Amino acid sequence: IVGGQECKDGECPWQALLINEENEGFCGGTILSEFYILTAAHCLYQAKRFKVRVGDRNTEQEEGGEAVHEVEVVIKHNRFTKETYDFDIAVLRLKTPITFRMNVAPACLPERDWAESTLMTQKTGIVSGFGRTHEKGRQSTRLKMLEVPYVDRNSCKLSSSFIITQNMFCAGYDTKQEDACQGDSGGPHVTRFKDTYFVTGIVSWGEGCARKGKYGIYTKVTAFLKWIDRSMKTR
Amino acid sequence: QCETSPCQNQGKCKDGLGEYTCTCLEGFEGKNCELFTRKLCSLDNGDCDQFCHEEQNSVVCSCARGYTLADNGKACIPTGPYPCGKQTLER
Ligand SMILES: N=C(N)c1cccc(-c2cccc([C@H](CCCNc3ccncc3)C(=O)O)c2)c1
Ligand SMILES: [Ca+2]
Q: What's the CATH code of the domain at A70?
């Protein structure tokens, strides 16, 4: 996350971290339930092998509360496209159930119609992760969050040099140096309504990080709510 | 103070002192029952704590898994210590 701030105690509990064979984070995810993590399909191709670690607030050192979970099954979307990142969504079934506790809790999955009319129509959303603190800097050892305004579709398309499909949406600022970055991908984008946070997107990609005239591209979850429903019944 | 008939839409005016009270009938809110009860979700999410949709030109609230719709039919009651979407603000 470029800009924004570190999550405050209990603030970003639905955050998950895909750690590679070296136990280093390379992508994020959203805790959907005790056995399921939501993430980006494209992250599936960025690690030889990985596990999902939850409850982590500082990757620097073990402070207790963290738990690593092995993945039992990977449910990547069939129509995922590596060039446009269309259908950039995947669900992960854990071998062992997460134990909801402090800084470890799921994010609500909203009903599609309501999310569109009442969530996607909010002024902003929230994105978090341990990704790059700068377009070419190091990743954050601390879990960070950033409120990002929702960006109109045409405005998004216009500002994009790459195709913006209906399975995506834009969030972020025009020139303000705040945005998600490499390392946050797969991570959550949630919209708050009356102090209840609903998953609304998946950090997918973006031309650089916090670039002028550039926005953050998120997988539009509302387009995959039924798909996620069926996926969470797998194995 | 009920003399002036301050309750609108046939409200139940109950007198007291330098004040009066209106008990609103069906489909009215406000000190004088002058406001229209939740008929759409666009205005205040229909007073719903979470999901809102309209059933028969009327607002109907619902909640996410791990919650139960309260008796008032607006609020959402957690069924557990860790419902989805709630930050774990414990300390
Ligand atoms: N600013 C953000 N919100 C954002 C969020 C997450 C990741 C990136 C990002 C930044 C620079 C380079 C790459 C690349 C990913 C290349 C894919 N590029 C595209 C372009 C158009 N459609 C699909 C994919 C990387 O992983 O190194 C990814 C930007
Ligand atoms: Ca740690």
A: 2.40.10.10
